[PDB]
Ligand SMILES: [Br-]
Ligand SMILES: [Br-]
Ligand SMILES: [Br-]
């Protein structure tokens with residue numbers, strides 16, 4: 329019943345730790361930062377889904 | 391350092407969430423579980439190293 333609390337907090341915390349990049353520099357840099365941000369967001373997605381499926385609401389799911 | 395301890399706790403919990411796979415099985419099934427697990431680890435490394443730098 330305590331793993332559930334960590335799980336909800338971790339997920340919360342995961343998304344907050346990935347703010348969008350500040351627009352600055354050349355087109356090439358700005359594109360580079362946005363590509364990396366997107367990669368990180370997807371990673372945060374799969375991680376979260378894994379956590380939800382393990383510790384939370386999706387864990388009851390067949 | 392309240393917020394910092396919180397962060398490290400969540401990260402620790404995160405590593406906790408990716409236990410190594412049971413080793414038993416064919417070399418093929420073992421190679422696949424290991425590959426997938428390796429991927430999860432890297433994701434976690436990114437996040438954590440990312441949070442270290444930015445927190
Ligand atoms: Br916590
Ligand atoms: Br941008
Ligand atoms: Br660049």
Ligand SMILES: [Br-]
Nearest residue numbers: 359360362363
């Ligand atoms: Br690109």
Ligand SMILES: [Br-]
Nearest residue numbers: 412413414415
């Ligand atoms: Br066994």
Ligand SMILES: [Br-]
Nearest residue numbers: 438439440442
């Ligand atoms: Br680190």
Ligand SMILES: [Br-]
Nearest residue numbers: 439442443444
């Ligand atoms: Br650093």
